[PDB]
Amino acid sequence: EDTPQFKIDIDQEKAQALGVSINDINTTLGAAWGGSYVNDFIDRGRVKKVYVMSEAKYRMLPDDIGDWYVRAADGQMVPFSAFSSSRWEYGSPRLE
Amino acid sequence: GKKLLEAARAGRDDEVRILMANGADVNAADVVGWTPLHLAAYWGHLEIVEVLLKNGADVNAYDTLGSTPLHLAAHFGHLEIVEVLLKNGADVNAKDDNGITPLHLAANRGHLEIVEVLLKYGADVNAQDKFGKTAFDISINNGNEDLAEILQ
Amino acid sequence: LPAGATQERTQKVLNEVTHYYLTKEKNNVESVFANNGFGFAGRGQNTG
Amino acid sequence: NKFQLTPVDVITAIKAQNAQVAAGQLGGTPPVKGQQLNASIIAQTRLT
Amino acid sequence: STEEFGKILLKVNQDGSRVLLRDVAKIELGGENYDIIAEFNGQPASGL
């Protein structure tokens, strides 16, 4: 059955205003909260994966969303709460 | 409380009006803060909204992000539920954690009738969200000719 | 059609074709399915 | 190094000037009414 | 939808005015290409 899920919207105008590219925004959100396969390394002669992901305590609750920052073209660091609005909604965890 | 949350999500009329007789908490909230009244406004169950409200359900309860049942119902085009909520004292200009009001949500989807019902009940047309946007700014940005005119 | 001939030019011709079958072969032809743009010799705006 | 260039720029220039380009068509589909000319537009081709 | 594609924010000018996608283009559902005209007795047709 459907479960609650955290909808987060990126303000295209404010991001454009602050000089903060959308790619900087999304890859930050995803690699932090979802993690990112970056490349491979060699563990004892065996090639294995290299993931970057936020530490657990910084990707748990919606308040943690604010503590993540993206740099603008001018060089200033901008928090996520500047160009994002967030709500709750329901969706399926398993589409048949 | 847990059985009332899931019965109001599924929409069983008889089971909510028996759990209420079993002393079930009208304002029992799930892990995201959604009361049975939030559930019924989201899913459009008009008559469970009317059973809970007369049983003392908090009409202006807000979730862990500031959304009230009036937000949900005005957002998804539940006209008759917007009117029943406002008839039981729904905060017409409630502000969530992003500054979004029921008028903003109803204006984004183009619900002309809920906008006219919120405005009739005194919705702040110049109310601003966290980005300074009014219901009007939404209208011109969406290209909504009909709604841009209703919003003054 | 000739080289570089356009789509609208082919279509007038295929309509003349379909008009013949449905009029002067009215007893024998049920229907005609015209395709402008591709043919046996190849594709192009000048084949149908 | 005489002209402040690196293999990077050589590779970039070969990639830029030895290439093949999709350019579309004069009178390409969908066309306007009464187009009489349809022709392949030939942009940059491979070096030889 | 065509409306959502229409309100894509291309550019915010210095005076604030937002250049939207519909301001520079027309937006509609359409075919993937328009190279083939398929007619069944001169009527519009698709098929299998």
UniProtKB/Swiss-Prot annotation, chain A:
Mutant phenotype after disruption: Loss of susceptibility to contact-dependent growth inhibition (CDI); inhibiting cells still contact the target.
Superkingdom of the source species: Bacteria
Signal peptide: none
Disulfide bonds: none
Induction context: Positively regulated by MarA, Rob and SoxS transcriptional regulators (at protein level).
Compartments where found: Cell inner membrane
Protein purpose: AcrA-AcrB-AcrZ-TolC is a drug efflux protein complex with broad substrate specificity that uses the proton motive force to export substrates.
Binding partners and assembly: Homotrimer, with large domains that extend into the periplasm, interacts with AcrA and TolC. AcrA may be required to stably link this protein and TolC. Interacts with AcrZ. Part of the AcrA-AcrB-AcrZ-TolC efflux pump.
Family affiliation: Belongs to the resistance-nodulation-cell division (RND) (TC 2.A.6) family.
Protein name: Multidrug efflux pump subunit AcrB
Organism: Escherichia coli (strain K12)
Full-sequence range covered: 722 to 817 of 1049
Curated annotation (Swiss-Prot), chain E:
Disruption phenotype: Loss of susceptibility to contact-dependent growth inhibition (CDI); inhibiting cells still contact the target.
Induction notes from the record: Positively regulated by MarA, Rob and SoxS transcriptional regulators (at protein level).
Compartments (UniProt record): Cell inner membrane
Family as reported in the entry's similarity comment: Belongs to the resistance-nodulation-cell division (RND) (TC 2.A.6) family.
Physiological role: AcrA-AcrB-AcrZ-TolC is a drug efflux protein complex with broad substrate specificity that uses the proton motive force to export substrates. (Microbial infection) Involved in contact-dependent growth inhibition (CDI), acts downstream of BamA, the receptor for CDI. Its role in CDI is independent of the AcrA-AcrB-TolC efflux pump complex.
Subunit organization: Homotrimer, with large domains that extend into the periplasm, interacts with AcrA and TolC. AcrA may be required to stably link this protein and TolC. Interacts with AcrZ. Part of the AcrA-AcrB-AcrZ-TolC efflux pump.
Official protein name in the record: Multidrug efflux pump subunit AcrB
Span covered, complete protein: 242 to 289 of 1049
